[PDB]
Design a protein around this ligand. Structure first.
Ligand SMILES: *[C@H](CNCCCCN1c2ccccc2CCc2ccc(Cl)cc21)CC(=O)OCC
Length: 375
């Protein structure tokens, strides 16, 4: 079979070029109004195919700049706008999570929310088509709905561990004596909201014979049922840029890496293929502070750290042992450099992180995170 790298090349080779399109797609935007200006332009074009042309974006009438770099800035700027929870379209999947899901109440304040989601889909399809990344990460059920993959109980674990444990208990044991009913209770605004799960659900006891249906219905209620129109509108915009049978060569994890440049960063594999300079070592106390700092960093900041030291967002295939610099192969390297009062600097070409010798873990935490907040 094909690994992710071979799948991506296979994918790009089928994404054949349009020639019935204007060769440039021009859009002029003002930074203060980048979302409305982008929405009116992208939702206004004749054919979605116009968005496949080379992007020529101009911000605030700033003339004579690289049309490739400003495109990358636009994708970042429009991502922070589209995925802002204050707009009511997307929301955080949980108070303790940073992953996003579609807000079920998206329509309450946005009567026109369905065209907004189609716009977000077009932008997402544009990022994939033009080889650019979106800034934002969604729950795994989001990527699976894009691929028409069924939402399973395992997907609940990555979002809510305590309810996943409860549903896994139900699956593994006879739940009849608990007298569970085909209803769902949700805690919103200090009040219980009961929702039967099928007609007459309050009178239907969850037994061994119907629990698979029960779990399925709970899964749909949590991730699918209240967002089907928003997701359909998003997919409609996305498939206007990427044919939906082409996207299906990827699984959910590959798709997230392709769209948003994100995934799990095995901190171990990072550790074993790390080299040290000028007195540092694996057992050195600053180094073991560095590694537990990275351990307790969220999955996004682990990525932003690698970008800071490498200069790229992706992890190389087969792990960190095949990591490359600018003049050939080079593993990840931490060097003693400087004095405790300075912030770490990274050298792009040699994948080297010049780390000052910090006198405390909490100091290493802050002085390291402040050097990455500007990436
Ligand atoms: C409900 C408030 N609804 C916000 C309006 C929609 C958001 N916009 C937008 C936002 C700022 C400036 C301009 C626009 C233009 C319209 C548009 C098009 C496309 C997209 Cl993706 C967004 C917008 C929020 C609420 O009540 O709950 C807050 C959590």
């Amino acid at each position: 079979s094909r690994d992710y790298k071979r799948k991506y090349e296979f994918f790009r080779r089928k994404l054949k070029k349009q020639n019935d399109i204007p060769n440039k797609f021009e859009m002029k935007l003002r930074r203060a109004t980048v979302l409305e200006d982008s929405y009116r332009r992208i939702m206004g074009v004749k054919r979605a195919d116009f968005l496949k042309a080379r992007l020529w974006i101009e911000f605030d009438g700033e003339k004579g700049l690289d049309y490739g770099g400003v495109a990358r800035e636009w994708f970042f700027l429009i991502s922070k706008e589209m995925f802002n929870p204050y707009y009511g379209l997307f929301e955080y999947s949980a108070t303790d999570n940073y992953t996003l899901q579609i807000n079920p109440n998206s329509g309450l304040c946005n009567e026109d929310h369905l065209s907004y989601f189609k716009f977000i889909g077009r932008v997402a399809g544009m990022a994939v088509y033009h080889g650019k990344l979106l800034d934002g990460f969604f729950i795994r059920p989001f990527y699976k709905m894009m691929l028409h993959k069924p939402i399973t109980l395992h997907d609940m674990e990555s979002v809510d561990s305590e309810y996943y444990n409860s549903l896994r208990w139900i699956l593994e044991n006879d739940p009849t004596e608990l007298d569970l009913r085909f209803i769902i209770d949700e805690e919103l605004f200090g009040q219980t909201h009961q929702h039967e799960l099928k007609n007459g659900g309050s009178e239907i006891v969850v037994t061994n014979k119907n629990k698979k249906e029960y779990i399925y219905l709970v899964i749909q209620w949590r991730f699918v049922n209240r967002i089907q129109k928003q997701m359909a509108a998003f997919k409609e915009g996305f498939f206007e840029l990427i044919p939906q049978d082409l996207i299906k060569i990827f699984d959910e994890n590959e798709l997230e890496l392709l769209m948003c440049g994100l995934g799990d960063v095995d901190v171990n594999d990072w550790r074993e293929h790390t080299k040290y300079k000028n007195g540092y070592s694996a057992n050195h106390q600053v180094i073991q502070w560095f590694w537990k700092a990275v351990l307790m960093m969220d999955s996004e900041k682990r990525i932003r750290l690698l970008q800071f030291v490498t200069g790229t967002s992706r992890v190389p295939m087969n792990g960190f042992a095949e990591l490359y610099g600018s003049n050939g192969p080079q593993s990840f390297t931490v060097e003693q450099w400087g004095t405790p009062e300075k912030l770490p600097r990274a050298h792009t070409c040699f994948n080297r992180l010049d780390l000052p010798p910090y006198e405390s873990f909490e100091e290493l935490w802050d002085k390291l995170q402040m050097a990455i907040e500007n990436t």
